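Summary: Need help interpreting a holo structure output

Steps to reproduce:
1. Submit the protein chain below together with the SMILES for calcium ion.
2. Request a joint structure prediction with the ligand placed.
3. Inspect the structure token block that comes back.

Expected: a single structure record containing both the chain and the bound molecule.
Actual: see attached output.

Input attached:
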Amino acid sequence: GQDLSDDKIGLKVLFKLMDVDGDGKLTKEEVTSFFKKHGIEKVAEQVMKADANGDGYITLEEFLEFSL
Ligand SMILES: [Ca+2]
Ligand SMILES: [Ca+2]
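--- attached output ---
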């Protein structure tokens, strides 16, 4: 009876999992470690150019915005 999690349940899980600090937001450094798994460095320019708020970190929302 419990409503499952949006099809993006996987993305949300991984993101949160990478955030052992349970802050709900990943920092530039974190974004590099997560993407590092692919060996892609472009993630740095993408996360820096995607940060319109210059907060230096991305929350669940942002993480879901960077997937395509
Ligand atoms: Ca984090
Ligand atoms: Ca941001």
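--- end attachment ---

Reviewer comment: Residues 51, 53, 55, 58, 62 surround calcium ion (ligand 2) (CB under 6 Å). DSSP finds four helices and two strands in the chain.
Status: needs-info
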